[PDB]
Structures are given as structure tokens and as C-alpha cells.
Write the C-alpha cells for this entry.
Amino acid sequence: EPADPFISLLMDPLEESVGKVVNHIAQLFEEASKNEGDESLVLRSQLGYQLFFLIVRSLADGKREVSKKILSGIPTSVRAEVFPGLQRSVYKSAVFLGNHIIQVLLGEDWDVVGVAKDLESAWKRRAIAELIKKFQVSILEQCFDKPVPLIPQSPLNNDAVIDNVNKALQFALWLTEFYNETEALGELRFLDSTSKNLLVDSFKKFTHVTRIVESLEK
Amino acid sequence: EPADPFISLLMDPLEESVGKVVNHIAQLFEEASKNEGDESLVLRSQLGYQLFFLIVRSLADGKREVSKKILSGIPTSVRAEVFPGLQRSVYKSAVFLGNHIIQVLLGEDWDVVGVAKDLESAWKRRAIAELIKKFQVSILEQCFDKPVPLIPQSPLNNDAVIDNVNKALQFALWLTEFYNETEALGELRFLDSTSKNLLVDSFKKFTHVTRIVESLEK
């Protein structure tokens, strides 16, 4: 049920609604940059995290190409701050990897999309990790002062959804930061249920697979 | 024993040597930015991480004010990328907190230095966390293609030192990201030895203390 602009636009996601929200956040960001310098920048932090909230939202509802459309609707000046440095270059792989892991937890070829080649680079790895991190704390913290469901029309299951997505992004971070060591294995104690079998089933159809199947048995 | 410029400058730290190294990294970064655009930026990633390596080095040898001097010897254009957004504003608190935890693990008033007020802000928290993260993976990854000791004149104990400092920064990250919950407690399984008692002894002299002493007993 609508009443305000932004809150009504924050409901169901499509190219239209999502695009509107993005542009209109980019406005706050824009005139922030046009006037109040560093203070404005401090605002731009939270604003960017709202953008990341939109991205994660696009990841959870199975709308990955929309997550890719997020980057297009953002001014380059804004993009320079929100995705600083190498982050803007590996954004595609971050979105792809995140979407893959998230959808796996919920229940394309990596070399073709260019994810593997990005994982070969340690710096691109770290950038991807930064982005996935941002994805995580974008739904962890209160981007909006008014609580808005990560998935529209699912208010009661909001904390469940958020916890799940968070754990998914956590395992993605594990993948990036540990691209079967003992120390690496100690960081898998976070898992709850169903996840391991989902890894098995997903990587069965898809040498990352090898490394993970090796890690699990240890 | 010296032979090259950079490698010889990468030895013992003082205002002179450290300053030289910083300026000279800032040169590579500079002419990178002056020509090869995005590729240059990709270089600027690793370069910035070398800068962070210098910062961590300044944290480990008990030279915190030098870590603060790092920021001064860096061009603003470079600073915009290396410390993007709110990171440049909370850099002081990141350096301070990191130094505190590191020196505690090895064996000033927080409200006065402004750390507590920064921890009150979730976005400043996240920024600090990003910086500490960068500190961690700056010593985790090979910033220089030639291995250079984190602490000069300590080559054999290099991996020991690195592991220790890494764990310190890890606990700092725990402090930032969990500013006595069950889920929060599960993230304390990383501890090895001596650390808990160091927390006790350090916070005994120093309501963060309260929250930690509460967490430990649970």
C-alpha cells in the first residue's frame, strides 16, 4: 500500500521502479556533491550503501541482469566513490558470483563470464571481496531510517531472508578470501544447514569445484 | 645490506626513509594516473596496498605517529583512491585502534582521540573496518614481488610476526563489526593463546571494556 514516493517505489522491482529509485538516490548524492563537500560525502556513504541494498535486492529475487543495470543508472562521478578503484572493473564478476552463491543457498560458465580470470588476480580478488562485503553490510545496517523489506511483499520472513542472504554472501567472501588449508577450514564453522549439500549439488553440475570438494572432506 | 634504491629504503623505518618510500610510490601512482587510465588504476590498487603495508609496518614497530605521517606524504589525488570516501576521515581512528590492538597482542583515551565517537557511527564503523581489512590483506598479499620483512632485521621470524599482526587486525575487525551475542561469540574461535589475558590486562587499565568482559564470560 503506497503513500509516499520513495517508499512506494521501494516495493516490487522492475527496470522501471528500480531505475527510478537509482536515479533519485543519485540526486541526493548529486546535490550533496554540488554543495556540502566532506559532510555531503559522509552522506554519500550511506547513500551508496542504499545503492548496494538495491543490488543485493536484485540478487535475491533472481534478477541478476538488473543488478548489472544498477551500474548503468549511476553517474560516473558517483560511481567513482561508490565503486572506487578496481571495484568498478570487477563489479560484473562480484554480481555474478554473489548471485550464484545466493541462488545456490536459496535452492553461466565462469570462464565465459570472466569470473575465473578475475579470481586468478589477487587484487581483483580483493576488490571483489570488498564489493561482496559491501553487499553484506548493505543489508546488515539500516540504509533507510524506515525498515524496508529486502524482498517486497515478504515482511514477516524479512529477518529469515536477510540472515540467509547474509550467510550466502559470507560463503562468497570465504571463496574469494581463500582462493583446503587448516586455517581456511576453521572459517567454515559458520554454516548452519542445507548449505553443504547445496554446494555439492551445484558444483556437481558445474578446479574450484575440486578445491571445495577437497576442503569439505577434510 | 643495500644494493638497490627501493629495497635499501625498505629497511629500517624513520621519518626520512618512510617519507622517501611514500613519495617514490606516489610517483609510480602519479605517472600511472597521468597516462594509462584504467590499467594505470589497476596498478594503483597494488601500489596503494604497498602504502597500506607501510602503514601496518608503522603499526607493528610501535611508530603510530609515523602511521599518521603516512597520510600527509600522499598526494590528494592519490588519497582519493587509496582512502575513498569516509575512509580518509576515520583514518586516524583506524590507525589508533589498530595500533592499540596490535601492541596489546604484542604485549591514549579513546574519547579524547575521537575513536569512541567514530564507533558510535555505523558508517564510520564500516569505513574503519574497511581500512583495517586493507591493513590485513596488505600484509597477506605480495605487495612487492620481492619479499620484504614486515619488521626490518627480523627475517626468520617474519611469518610469525605476520601471522600475529594478522590475528590482531582480525580481532580489531571483530571489535568494529560487532560494536556478547551468540553469533558474535561464534566469531571468537580464531583466538590462539595469550590473547584473552592481554585483553583482560589491557582493558583493566582502560563501556567497550564492559561489553568485552561480558562477552568473554559467555
Chain B touches chain A at residues 38, 41-42, 44-46, 48-49, 81, 84-86, 89, 122-123, 126-127, 130, 133, 137, 141-142, 186, 189-190 (CB under 8 Å). Residues 23 and 73 of chain B are 6 Å apart (CA to CA). Residues 1-218 of chain B form one domain.
